[PDB]
Every structure is written in C-alpha cells, then in structure tokens.
Design a protein around this ligand. Structure first.
Ligand SMILES: [K+]
Ligand SMILES: [K+]
Ligand SMILES: [K+]
Ligand SMILES: [K+]
Ligand SMILES: [K+]
Ligand SMILES: [K+]
Ligand SMILES: [K+]
Ligand SMILES: [K+]
Ligand SMILES: [Mg+2]
Ligand SMILES: [Mg+2]
Ligand SMILES: [Mg+2]
Ligand SMILES: [Mg+2]
Ligand SMILES: [Mg+2]
Ligand SMILES: [Mg+2]
Ligand SMILES: [Mg+2]
Ligand SMILES: [Mg+2]
Ligand SMILES: [Mg+2]
Ligand SMILES: [Mg+2]
Ligand SMILES: [Mg+2]
Ligand SMILES: [Mg+2]
Ligand SMILES: [Mg+2]
Ligand SMILES: [Mg+2]
Ligand SMILES: [Mg+2]
Ligand SMILES: [Mg+2]
Ligand SMILES: [Mg+2]
Ligand SMILES: [Mg+2]
Ligand SMILES: [Mg+2]
Ligand SMILES: [Mg+2]
Ligand SMILES: [Mg+2]
Ligand SMILES: [Mg+2]
Ligand SMILES: [Mg+2]
Ligand SMILES: [Mg+2]
Ligand SMILES: [Mg+2]
Ligand SMILES: [Mg+2]
Ligand SMILES: [Mg+2]
Ligand SMILES: [Mg+2]
Ligand SMILES: [Mg+2]
Ligand SMILES: [Mg+2]
Ligand SMILES: [Mg+2]
Ligand SMILES: [Mg+2]
Ligand SMILES: [Mg+2]
Ligand SMILES: [Mg+2]
Ligand SMILES: [Mg+2]
Ligand SMILES: [Mg+2]
Ligand SMILES: [Mg+2]
Ligand SMILES: [Mg+2]
Ligand SMILES: [Mg+2]
Ligand SMILES: [Zn+2]
Lengths: 46, 110, 192, 235, 119, 45, 57
RNA sequence: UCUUACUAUAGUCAGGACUAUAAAGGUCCGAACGGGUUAUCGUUGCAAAGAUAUCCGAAGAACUAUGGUAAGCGAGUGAA
RNA sequence: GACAUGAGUAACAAAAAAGAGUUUAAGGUACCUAAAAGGUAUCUUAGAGUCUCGCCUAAAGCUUAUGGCUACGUCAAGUAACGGCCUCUAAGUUUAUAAUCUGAAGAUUAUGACGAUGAGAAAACUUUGGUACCAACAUUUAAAAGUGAAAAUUGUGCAGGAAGGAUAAACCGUACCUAGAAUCUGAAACAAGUAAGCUAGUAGAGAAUACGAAGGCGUGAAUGAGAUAACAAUCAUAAAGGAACUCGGCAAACUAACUACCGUAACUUAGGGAUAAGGAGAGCUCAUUAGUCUCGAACGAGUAAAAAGGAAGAAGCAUGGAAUAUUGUUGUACGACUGUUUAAUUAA
RNA sequence: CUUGGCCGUUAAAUGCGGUCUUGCAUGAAUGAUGUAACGAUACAACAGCUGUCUCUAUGAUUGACUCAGUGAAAUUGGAA
RNA sequence: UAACAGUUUUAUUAACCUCUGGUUUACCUGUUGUUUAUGUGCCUU
C-alpha cells in the first residue's frame, strides 16, 4: 500500500526538483515545458 | 430462585473452552451446535442453548418434619426448599412413601 | 449471573460515582435545591438524609464524617450544624423531597427531578400548594382533600408554620400570579 | 495558598485619596520606620547614584508596564514582572519598536538613593496587586469578570493607566514603610520633593489628583537624542 | 483434598518420607481423610520402601477443612498418609504424629490402634 | 540565617508563585506592605 | 444477506407491533390548569415559582 | 522529499556500576531515543501495519537533522 | 445515473469525568395585557463565565520551526532583547569560458560562477602550525558558595580529527496552529507520525517512580440519559492441590530496586564465570558526638543544623510500609562474540 | 529400515543426555573436532511459582440491551 | 422399663446457603508517599 512519503517534505526541495528554473536551463526540461505548454497547462512547474 | 438469562455453563453445565492456549474470544461459549449436511442441515430440536433460568416450580421429596409449633405457626423440615425467603410453598405428604397411620388421619379430622 | 446491584452505578467508576454524590449534596445544602436527573436525585437523597442525621449528633465522629462528605467544609459546616440542625430537630426522618419534572435537557429527553430540602426557603411543594390555595380563594372555589392534605404537610414542622404559608398566599395574590388560570370547573370542556 | 482582598472601603496612608473606596487619608498604621524619621537617608550599601532616578517603560500598543532602576530594560524584567495573562499574550522577548519610556521619577535628594529603592518597591508591589487581587475592577470600571478569558487577559496587560495612578499614590505616601515621608519627631511629618518626567503630557492625567510635592516636566533625558519628540497637550 | 501430583508426608516407619499421589482409588472426587490412594515414594528416611516404589496409602490428615456430623470442623497444617498393602494392612508398625478422627467410621481400626493421639 | 552551608535545613517554599494566577484572581501569596490599602483607581483611556 | 428483503416482510418488521404509543397519563395543573404529566410538576409554574422565590424573600 | 548506500555540514545519548585510566571498553544495569522478541486485542480496525503488556540495544559497525550524489537495453543501492 | 435491500441496524467505548448555578445576542412558543409595546417563564441557535470535582504534567503546558485550503491592521539600522537579504566557502551543480575526447545528444579537466545543514567586525551604547589546533573524551577556569552554558586552558587515546573570506540607516519575514480536543503528514475532525528551547515543588543517584503549582483539557450533540442479562474485551481476588493444562509452563504468578554489607562452585582463552548461588540490613523514636556549624559566655548549651551513631526502644498482621526494576539452577545442538537481514506473515 | 542396542532421567520416554566395532546417504578451510564467554535462536530436566488445569465462582469498568439524536457497509435473479 | 451407645459406599441430576470456604470497587480498622482546604503553631523582655 501507499506510504507517507511527503512527511517532513520541505518547499525548498520542490523548487529545486520541479521548479521552473530547473526546466528552462536543461535540455530535457524544455520538452516538459513545451509539452505542458502545448496541452494548455497553467502550472508549468511546481 | 430466578436467575435471568443464563449462559451455557450455569444453565446446562457446559465445560467451556480453554483460557490461554490460543483461544480467541471463545472461553465461555457453547461451541458447536450440531453436525453438517448429514445431520439435517439444521439445529436439532431440544438443543441445549443459553436462555432464562430459574423461577420454575421444583419439588423436594421425602423431607421429614423435625418440629411442629402451633403458636409460632412454623413447621420445620429437614433439608432445603426451593425459592426465596417469603415465598409461598406447597407442603403435602410424600407420594413415594406410605400414607400416615389411619389413627392419625382420623385424629386430625376429629 | 451474580447478585443484584446494591444501588445505582450511573455508568461511572467507583471514585467518580462518590464525587458525584458529594457534589450533589454539596450543591443542595449550599443552594437548598438542585434540578438533576431522577436517578441521581434518588441516589443523593439517601446520602443527603444520612448527612443531616450527622448534623443532629453531639459526638465528634459525626463532625469528622460530615467533613468528609462535603467538598467545602469550612464554608458549609457551620450551616450544616447550624441552620440545618435547628430546622430538622423535631422531624423524625424524611428531610428531603424528590419531585419529578419534565426533561431538563430536551436533547436526550431524560427523566429529571428536583431534590430539595423540606421546610426550606426554596420548597417547591410549599409554593405550589400556596399557588393552588391562592387560585382557589381568587376563584371562589373549594380546595380539594389533596390540597388540604398538602397544606398541613408543608406547615406542620415549619417554624412559622401557617403564618409563613398565609404570607406566601398573600404575596401571590397582590402580584396577580394566578392571572389566566383555567378554573377547575372548566377542565372537562377542554379538548386541548 | 493565597488570600484575595475584597473591594471594601479602607484607610490610606497617603495624603491624597487614591480611590473612591479610600475612607481616611494620612493615617499612621505603624510607627515611623528606621529611615522614615531621618532627614537624609543615604546610599549606604548600594552603588553611587542608584536610587536617584527610576524609569518606567510601557508597551505602546498593549499597555504592559515595566519598572527599572537603570535607564534601560533587559530580559530579566520581562520574566520577573510579567505574569501569565493567557496564550499569545506574553511576549517571548522585548521588541525595540514597541517599548518606549513611560515616565522617569527624579528625587530632590541627589544622593538619597534609599528613598528611590522604596518608591520602586511600592510600585512593583502595587503592580503585582493590580494583576492579582483586582477585586475593584471585577464588577466595576473595566468589569474584567464580565469579559472572556481572552479579553480579560488583554485588559490585565494594560497596566499603563494603573501605573500612573500608582505613581501619584506612592509619591503621596501610599504604602506602609514608604520612605518618601520625613518625620521630624522633635511630631510633624512631611513629604519629600520629587520630579516626574513625562514622554506624553496626557499620560499624567490617568491619576485623578497629584500630590503637592511632585513637579511635572515634559521629555525624558536621552529621548531627544534618539529623535523621539515628546507629546505636548498645549502644542 | 488429595488429587493427582499432590505431595504428602508419610508418618509411618515404612521407609518413605515424602510421597506423591498418583491415583484416587474407588472414587472420582478428591480424597479426604480415610480414603485410599496410590502414591510414589520420592524421599526416604535414615524391607523398607525404596524411592520410586508404588504403594497404597491412606489419608490420615489433610490441610483442607473437614466438616463433621456435629458441626465440628478440623484443619491440619499438612497432608499426611500411611502406606498400606493391597490387602489393607499397614506396612509400618508405628505411627508418629496426630491422625484424623475420620478413620474410625471408614473401617481403619488397625491404623488407629497404633495412633498415639487422635484429633 | 544561622546556618549557611549549602546543605542547611530547608524550611522555605521553593515554589514562589504557588497557587498564584492573574486570570483567576487568586490574590497575593503573602501579605505585602501595600496589601492593606485600596488599589488606586485611574482615569480610563 | 442472501436475498433482498421484500416490501411485505420489511413492512411487517417496521410497523406490526412498533406503533408509537399515545401518552394517556396526563392531568391538569392545580395552580394554572395547564395540561401537565401525571405525577409531574407543571413546567410553566415551576419556572415561574422558581423565579418568584428568587426576587423576594 | 519514501527507502538503500555514500557524501558535506551539524546535533544528541538522565543516572549509576565495573575496569588499567580523570579521559584508552563494538564493557555492564537502566530512561530518553532507537529496535520490533512473545502474547492478546483489532481484522468493513483508531491504523491499507495500530493499541496494551512484555522483551532487545542504549559510547557505538550508534542514532537524528538540513542538503547533495548514484535507478530503469546494460541494472541503481544492497552486513545479500 | 437515479433509487432500493441490509437498516433506522452497526457505529459516535485513547479506561481523564463530570455535577450544580449565572449570563449575552437573535429568534420560536404560553400567559399577562389588548393603546401598540413591554414584562414574566420556557425552548431553539451561536456564545461567555462562576463554584466544586477530576485528567495531563521532561505534557494533553509555554515559546518557536518544518509545514499550512486556518485568518489577513502581523509595525525592528544593529547589540542587550533578530532572522533573512548581503560577504566567504563545503558536499556538489553548471545551455559560463578555454582546451580535449566524442555517431548527434553529449562527456572530460582547469578556471569562473552558483551553492548551507557551517563561518561572518563592533555595541547600554556601536558603525605562525604544539610559538599549533578547536574533531571526540576528560580536566580546569568569570572568586561568598553551589549549579548550568559559553569561550578558553591542560592532558589522554588512536580511528589522527573542514573550506574560504576576513575583521543615519532600504528591502523581506513577524498574525494564528504544534497535534488529548477544531489548523502540520497519514485520502479525514484518524488512539499513528514530526525539529529546538523552557518544562514549579516534594522526593531521589537520576530526565526512573509517585503526587502535581501555574496552565491547558475533560472534542463541532462527532452524542447524551438509563439498565448493569448471556457473551466479549481489559482487569482484581481466591479454599485444597501446584503443570494433573498443553504440540510446548503459551499466558499468568513467583522473583525484583537499593547498601561503599557478608559470601560465592564447576570450568576457563586467566579477562572471566559473578550482580553467580546463598544470606543480612532498611521506616519511626532515642542514648551518645572527634571535628564542622550555631548560641551564650577555654568552657557551657543546641539537630527550630548537616551528618555520624548503636547488641537502645515503641506500636502494628505487616516498617525494600504505597509506586517503579519479571525467577534461580542444569545438560545439549547451532553460530565464537557486539552487530545485520525479507519497510508491512519467517530476526534465525 | 526405526520408537537401532545398552545405561541414566520419568510410577510409565518415539524425547533429552551418555555410549556402541552404530554410516540406505559423516568427514576434514561447501573446513573436521572439543572447551571458556555470549544468545528475545532450538530442545530437555530440577526447584520455586502460580486459575494452565482438577473446576470454576464472585467482583469492577467499557461494550452488548432500552429511550432520545445522528446515521454506514459488504450483500441482493425474483421469492408466499 | 428408662438411660446410654451403635446403625453403607460410589456415581449422577437438581435444588439450596444452616454449616465449612470463595467473593466483597458507596462497611470498620491500621498504614506509606504526596497534594489541597481549615484550624493551630517557636524563643525572649
Ligand atoms: K513501495
Ligand atoms: K482472550
Ligand atoms: K436449513
Ligand atoms: K473480531
Ligand atoms: K535587518
Ligand atoms: K557526442
Ligand atoms: K488457587
Ligand atoms: K454459605
Ligand atoms: Mg524526509
Ligand atoms: Mg432476585
Ligand atoms: Mg475452565
Ligand atoms: Mg432436509
Ligand atoms: Mg452511558
Ligand atoms: Mg482510586
Ligand atoms: Mg506571536
Ligand atoms: Mg531524502
Ligand atoms: Mg554497550
Ligand atoms: Mg541495558
Ligand atoms: Mg529493520
Ligand atoms: Mg517479525
Ligand atoms: Mg547486553
Ligand atoms: Mg441484524
Ligand atoms: Mg441490537
Ligand atoms: Mg451500539
Ligand atoms: Mg426569548
Ligand atoms: Mg559565491
Ligand atoms: Mg545557515
Ligand atoms: Mg491525533
Ligand atoms: Mg499525542
Ligand atoms: Mg488531519
Ligand atoms: Mg516518566
Ligand atoms: Mg493545546
Ligand atoms: Mg463535559
Ligand atoms: Mg492458599
Ligand atoms: Mg503432561
Ligand atoms: Mg493430557
Ligand atoms: Mg512466559
Ligand atoms: Mg530495625
Ligand atoms: Mg505485635
Ligand atoms: Mg550469532
Ligand atoms: Mg546479538
Ligand atoms: Mg517480514
Ligand atoms: Mg573442502
Ligand atoms: Mg562452519
Ligand atoms: Mg437509537
Ligand atoms: Mg447467612
Ligand atoms: Mg465511606
Ligand atoms: Zn401550572
């Protein structure tokens, strides 16, 4: 079954992993933004 | 003496089950209530089960008369008698014994 | 399967059930009356009548036992061995009265009652009977045998007695307390 | 075990009537103390200058008051002078942007430091008896007993008005063993001269009446240097 | 009330000092004063009985209270017995200690003949 | 203080603020020099 | 449950002998003549008399 | 952001006892803390891994915190 | 998708716990009174408080973090009584630069930049390498005494214990919640889980155990009032016997902690075994006192001084008086040992 | 094969311990063999201890039952 | 004639508390730690 994996989770690790700068500055991150931007998402990251 | 709803141990002398050797929630229960398909696929009539106990008539036979006091109004009999103090009981000559002598039966009527 | 209960347990523990009775008897003596549930009013009635018996004793063992029942002895002991002792000197028992009333709490609809001290400043049967006699005199009716029987009960052992009861009736007429009271001769004609 | 008094009329030792409950004034409840009948009590066993001035700081938003002998307060004052008045009502520290000087008491005697240590003692005991044993504000005035435990704790934190009425009392001889009396015992007694410096001219009107031995001055030394200008009623 | 695995004190000069009950002879209920049992000698004293021998014994006194006809109840501080043979005669020739008085009605005259004091 | 060594007999209540609260108006623990006078009443804000 | 309980059998259990019993132990109040419960105090007179003994005495 | 290993910077381990040491021990008894031995309860549970008692370690191969590194053709990490 | 059945059933039981008064607002009833109004009493909804009682207490308290579908009048040049921003750098990161390698993508080394969980002048006014170092452990030190930090001093062991820079007041954070009573993670108002400091006192070696000052709490009817059957759970006691139970002493009971007490076997890698085993003592009162301390005047007196003290004494069924610490011994198999392991059925 | 033979332990031993010239199918770093110490490993015995049992009884709290309020679930071809 | 003394066991079913025991959670007594309230409380002139 699922586990409580978000216990003790901080919001500084959310910007370093799934933030916006982590995606525009990486080759594989531009795809995610372009993919999410083509679908029409508002929340491109974090 | 009425005893309300009695279980299997008090009402029918069921032995019960174990206390500590792994028993789960079944220490004073009745256990099995019959066989399976070959025994009728039903609980058989006359099965001993929990229910109300007491408050039923009971006879004690062959109790001698130790004392007879007219002033006090008491008739002391050997042994125990069914019921609680202040309960009405029926006293009569024993049925499994010879009736009282003929002379006595006439003296009392006289 | 065992023996019958000696008294009411009131779904409480031993220590919790003794404090409940010491608190009901403490509020009764302090306030002269309490409105509670009926089972509690009947369990505290036996302890309230056994505490007033200790207030009519001359030994110290009674003064130490009465100190162990109340929760504020320093404030309530003078009243116990004072006013309360003087009031019940001539009465042989029956110092308290339990009267059933409508549910105090409408959520649970639990039967309630009023445990009070007879011949006290807040006797509810003394004021209810004075209100019945105040309505009979203001309506030119005749009191029933049950009212005359209650008039003597609430005035036999009272200090002032009848004089304190006539003043209660007089105050209930100058105040117009029986205004709007249905005459007893018209009860047979009322469906609701 | 504690014993709370009742809001009943009582006599005062001060020359003025501190409260409407005060029955009599300038009543001797005990023979003059050792230093009371002394023209010049001195700083016998205290540092030079100690007791000549007494500062009073207050929270400009909540009204919490603190008394200090030195020109500045520390963390010891907040712990030893602020009783618990509820959750989120006792600050964890002293915030420089909230605490300002309320007033400053200066005695005429430039070296009678023992007279100030007595005024500071009665002010701290009165403040404790204002947060505790507030029977005169339970059903009258602020009516603290008619308020919630939250609102009641916020009104107890506001000791600024009470503190000003405590100064007019202590400086008028209130308290037993007050060293601001001076008994000649040749037996005539009088009050010692004092001066009160106020950061706000309107803050001295919390006391219904002041004694005749106190002089009121606006502004506290060292305040102007901090670019803090005093408040003047006349303007 | 002597039952299986009950330790008794043998008070005769047969050779045993502490025997363990192994069977109640002639009844299902636990044995009281004057009832037969089968014991196993566990200790001796210094044709005596050797440790481990199986013999018949008679309960002479018990620690469980024994009510009597006249309402007089007796209680001893320990459970004791005397060894006997399958015929019913005591093996020992002398008994040291007080024995229960319930042996008279249970046809144990021989055991009482050499009993110094009865209680 | 007669005996001053650190093991001297302790006869004081080390819980200074025992049964003392402002929200409940418990009152002062001990009798002070200002406890016999009426609390000065100020002019409200 | 092996089978769904029918409308007939579920109506038997719900209303057969489970009708709300009408309270018939009522009598008027002697002080005001309102409908009170037998052996119980009048709630309208209790509160009023309880409040009348608190003002004067 | 779970978890495994490593890594950098930090923190924690009442008290008592033995031992050659004032401090040199994968030492001893035992809280915190960390484990999860046995048992009962629970099993549409308070809980998709919990409660109670009991038990084990508790200056070390210890435990914890905030970051970082290594994982998905080949297998990352693994006192396995 | 709607609506049935089970069923008006289960459930609202963390072994803390409640009882009796008072009161505010709005509204619903009945009466008074019919000039509307208002008054008295009662009920409903949302609150508040008083007295008594109990529970938590090295918490279920206070102050704050992580965090937040709780809410927006939360206020700082700096120190006392503050963090961030900013400066320096670690582990590392780099679509920065150069060189190099490379099917493309990319990778590598150096430099630069960035990167806290670390380091950053002064202030109750202020702006070289033991000539060492600030890992662990121990010791010593702000002079009336004791205690707890900080920083430093000295020493010990081997497992041999960072980097770099120095050296007239902007901007951002500030409210509430800390999980036993309305807020974090567990799908939720979940008996679980989560960081730091403080966390009365008595009593102890102690943060153990017991009581509990303040404080909070005894949940949003997500409940309340009765009754006290069987049975279930969690417990308490028990005649005689004492493992006869059972796959098996599973569970439970016995034992227990303490003293500078006595004594302690086989065997042994000579360290152990060992706190072996097995015994003794304990609270209250008191004679007695070398010194220390106090009082009076060397001496005298004193435990309304700490201790010491004895083959003294009193009372009771009982003085390890309540709570806390779960038996002893013996012969084997396996693996030397301390440890590790299938998160959530196998801990060996 | 088998509860191998013998001895000790038990009133009674397919067990445990010792022993045999005892290996269907032991064996030497897939190490062989015997001790000290250690073990929440596994088996066996002794003493104590006990409701484990002979053989259960009584008592306490929370549920279970009744009244008031709120109000599920698995399941169900249809059912006299 | 009086008086004195003696006149089964086991098993099972049910009832029953006189006796012998067990139980006793609002009974009496003794007692430890600690808290709360009330009263009282040292020497000397
Ligand atoms: K997983
Ligand atoms: K069970
Ligand atoms: K059938
Ligand atoms: K179950
Ligand atoms: K700043
Ligand atoms: K490439
Ligand atoms: K027993
Ligand atoms: K009996
Ligand atoms: Mg985490
Ligand atoms: Mg009956
Ligand atoms: Mg049984
Ligand atoms: Mg058939
Ligand atoms: Mg209930
Ligand atoms: Mg208790
Ligand atoms: Mg705050
Ligand atoms: Mg992580
Ligand atoms: Mg260790
Ligand atoms: Mg340990
Ligand atoms: Mg693990
Ligand atoms: Mg496991
Ligand atoms: Mg160990
Ligand atoms: Mg059903
Ligand atoms: Mg039901
Ligand atoms: Mg239910
Ligand atoms: Mg209204
Ligand atoms: Mg940088
Ligand atoms: Mg940092
Ligand atoms: Mg929770
Ligand atoms: Mg918790
Ligand atoms: Mg939640
Ligand atoms: Mg603890
Ligand atoms: Mg809280
Ligand atoms: Mg409540
Ligand atoms: Mg016994
Ligand atoms: Mg057996
Ligand atoms: Mg068997
Ligand atoms: Mg066990
Ligand atoms: Mg002794
Ligand atoms: Mg004696
Ligand atoms: Mg091992
Ligand atoms: Mg191990
Ligand atoms: Mg597993
Ligand atoms: Mg090999
Ligand atoms: Mg090997
Ligand atoms: Mg219902
Ligand atoms: Mg009897
Ligand atoms: Mg009693
Ligand atoms: Zn009426």
């Amino acid at each position: 079954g699922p586990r409580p994996t978000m216990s003790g989770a901080t919001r500084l690790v959310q910007k370093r992993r799934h933030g916006f700068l982590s995606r525009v500055k990486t080759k594989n991150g531009q795809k995610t933004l372009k993919r999410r931007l083509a679908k029409g998402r508002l929340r491109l990251s974090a | 003496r009425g005893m309300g709803f009695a279980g299997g141990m008090k009402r029918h002398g069921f032995a019960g089950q174990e206390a500590s050797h792994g028993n789960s929630l079944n220490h004073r229960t009745i256990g099995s209530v019959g066989g399976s398909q070959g025994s009728g696929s039903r609980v058989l009539p006359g099965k001993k089960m929990p229910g109300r106990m007491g408050a039923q008539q009971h006879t004690v036979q062959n109790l001698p008369i130790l004392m007879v006091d007219n002033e006090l109004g008491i008739v002391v009999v050997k042994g125990a008698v069914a019921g609680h103090k202040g309960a009405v009981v029926k006293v009569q000559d024993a049925v499994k014994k010879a009736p009282p002598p003929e002379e006595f039966v006439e003296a009392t009527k006289q | 399967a065992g023996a019958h209960v000696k008294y009411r347990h009131l779904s409480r523990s031993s220590a919790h059930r003794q404090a409940l009775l010491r608190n009901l008897v403490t509020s009764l003596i302090k306030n002269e009356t309490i409105h509670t549930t009926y089972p509690k009013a009947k369990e505290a009635q036996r302890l309230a009548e056994k505490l007033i018996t200790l207030s009519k004793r001359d030994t110290e063992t009674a003064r130490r036992s009465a100190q162990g029942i109340l929760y504020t002895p320093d404030q309530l002991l003078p009243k116990l061995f004072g006013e309360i002792r003087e009031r019940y000197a001539n009465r042989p028992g029956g110092y308290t009265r339990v009267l059933r009333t409508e549910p105090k709490d409408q959520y649970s609809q639990a039967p309630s009652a009023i445990l009070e001290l007879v011949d006290g400043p807040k006797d509810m049967r003394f004021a209810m009977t004075a209100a019945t006699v105040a309505r009979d005199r203001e309506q030119k009716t005749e009191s029933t045998d049950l009212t005359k029987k209650n008039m003597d009960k609430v005035t036999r052992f009272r200090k002032d007695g009848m004089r304190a009861f006539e003043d209660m009736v007089a105050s209930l007429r100058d105040m117009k307390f029986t205004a709007g009271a249905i005459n007893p001769k018209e009860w047979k004609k009322l469906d609701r | 075990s504690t014993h709370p008094t009742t809001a009943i009329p009582k006599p005062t030792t001060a020359v003025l009537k501190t409260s409407p409950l005060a029955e009599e004034t300038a009543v001797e409840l005990k023979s003059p103390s050792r230093l009371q009948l002394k023209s010049e009590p001195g700083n016998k066993g205290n540092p030079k200058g100690h007791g000549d001035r007494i500062w009073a700081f207050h929270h400009i938003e909540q009204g919490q008051v603190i008394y200090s002998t030195k020109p500045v307060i520390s963390h010891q004052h907040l712990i030893r002078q602020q009783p618990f008045t509820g959750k989120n009502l006792v600050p964890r520290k002293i915030r420089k942007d909230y605490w300002r000087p309320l007033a400053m008491i200066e005695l005429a005697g430039k070296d009678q430091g023992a007279v100030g240590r007595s005024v500071y003692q009665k002010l701290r005991e009165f403040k404790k008896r204002h947060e505790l044993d507030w029977a005169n504000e339970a059903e009258e005035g602020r009516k603290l007993m008619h308020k919630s435990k939250r609102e009641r704790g916020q009104e107890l934190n506001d000791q600024k008005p009470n503190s000003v009425a405590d100064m007019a009392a202590v400086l008028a001889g209130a308290g037993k063993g007050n060293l601001m009396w001076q008994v000649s015992r040749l037996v005539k007694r009088q009050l010692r001269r004092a001066t009160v410096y106020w950061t706000n001219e309107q803050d001295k009107f919390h006391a219904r009446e002041w004694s005749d031995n106190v002089s009121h001055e606006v502004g506290i030394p060292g305040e102007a240097e901090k670019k803090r200008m005093p408040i003047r009623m006349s303007s | 009330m002597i039952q299986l695995k009950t330790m008794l004190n043998c008070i005769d000069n047969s050779g045993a000092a502490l025997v363990e009950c192994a069977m109640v002879v002639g009844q299902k209920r636990h044995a009281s004063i004057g009832d037969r049992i089968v014991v196993v000698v566990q200790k001796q004293r210094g044709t005596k009985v050797k440790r481990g021998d199986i013999r018949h014994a008679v309960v002479v006194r018990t620690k469980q209270k024994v009510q009597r006809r006249d309402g007089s109840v007796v209680r001893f501080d320990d459970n004791a017995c005397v060894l006997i043979n399958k015929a019913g005669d005591p093996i020992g020739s002398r008994i040291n200690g007080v024995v229960g008085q319930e042996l008279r009605k249970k046809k144990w005259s021989k055991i009482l003949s050499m009993a110094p004091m009865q209680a | 203080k007669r005996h001053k060594y650190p093991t001297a007999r302790v006869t004081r209540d080390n819980s200074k603020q025992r049964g003392e609260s402002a929200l409940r108006k418990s009152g002062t623990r001990w009798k002070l020099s200002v406890s016999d006078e009426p609390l000065p009443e100020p002019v409200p804000r | 449950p092996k089978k769904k309980t029918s409308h007939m059998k579920k109506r038997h259990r719900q209303m057969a002998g489970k009708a709300l019993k009408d309270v018939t132990h009522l009598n008027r109040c002697p002080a005001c003549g309102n409908l009170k419960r037998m052996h119980h105090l009048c709630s309208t007179c209790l509160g009023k008399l309880k409040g009348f003994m608190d003002r004067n005495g």
